[PDB]
């Protein structure tokens, strides 16, 4: 239905030991498709999905250039932040950037993003309106007044609405066989003793895409909000994801418990039990 395109950049300054390291990744929903690394041998925007490999030679040139300009921009921004936060040149710092767009089932614009972060905390972020900025601190306000005076947001709006959505649209049609194809979870149950009065029931879910899954547990008919250990959705290695939900039940009361699996790959949400 609804889709997303996101670009994540990371700039890590190396005190004295050469140029800072720049890593940039491009994602369409939960699937990565492009890569850039300042340490990598090519010094080019590298494909990481087969549906992007088809793209033109000047596409790769334009994309390499844009990401190359960014690496330079954030290495300058790392120097600017040392002045702004009055910090030593001997300390290693992190500068992260996220930008992208959301599209509806129809394919039209939904939301746009453009935000920075210095040393793990937020720095500056473009508001939902795509007209004003949000400065997290006093140092970020210097950037706010600069970009508001220069009318930067107008050029940001111009990309997010348009250049971005047309890009996502093209990427979706060119890779509909993988990006739009939903894989349902390959569910299974398990039981461990742990003690003579208690027992653990794990509700597994494997090989699914997209990553959004909702595994819930139930004692009788009602949902067990607490007492349910949920691991975070982890990647398999291939385009699929894995997740599990566990519950500590009183020994012998295993019949009372049922697991509710929710995924868009399923035509109706599953309800399972231990046997």
């Amino acid at each position: 239905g609804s889709h997303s395109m996101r670009y994540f950049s990371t700039s890590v300054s190396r005190p004295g030991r050469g140029e800072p390291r720049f890593i940039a990744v491009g994602y369409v929903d939960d699937t990565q498709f492009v890569r850039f690394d300042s340490d990598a041998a090519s010094q080019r925007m590298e494909p990481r999905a087969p549906w992007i490999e088809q793209e033109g030679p000047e596409y790769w040139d334009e994309e390499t250039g844009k990401v190359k300009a960014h690496s330079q921009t954030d290495r300058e921004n790392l120097r600017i932040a040392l002045r702004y936060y009055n910090q030593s040149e001997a300390g290693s710092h992190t500068l992260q950037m996220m930008f992208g767009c959301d599209v509806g089932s129809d394919g039209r614009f939904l939301r746009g993003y453009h935000q920075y972060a210095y040393d793990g905390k937020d720095y500056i972020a473009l508001k939902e309106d795509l007209r004003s900025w949000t400065a997290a601190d006093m140092a970020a306000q210097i950037t706010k007044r600069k970009w508001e005076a220069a009318h930067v947001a107008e050029q940001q709006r111009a990309y997010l609405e348009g250049t971005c959505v047309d890009g996502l649209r093209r990427y979706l049609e060119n890779g509909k066989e993988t990006l739009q194809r939903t894989d349902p979870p390959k569910t299974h149950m398990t039981h461990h003793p742990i003690s003579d009065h208690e027992a653990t029931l794990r509700c597994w879910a494997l090989g699914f895409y997209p990553a959004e899954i909702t595994l819930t547990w139930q004692r009788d008919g009602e949902d067990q909000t607490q007492d349910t250990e949920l691991v975070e959705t982890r990647p398999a290695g291939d385009g699929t994801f894995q997740k599990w939900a566990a519950v500590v039940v009183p020994s012998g009361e295993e019949q009372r418990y049922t697991c509710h699996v929710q995924h868009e790959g399923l035509p109706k949400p599953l309800t399972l039990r231990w046997e």
Partner: peptide, 9 residues
């Protein structure tokens, strides 16, 4: 389709 990330802090 990468954006023109060129503005300084």
């Amino acid at each position: 389709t990468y954006q023109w990330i060129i503005r300084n802090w």
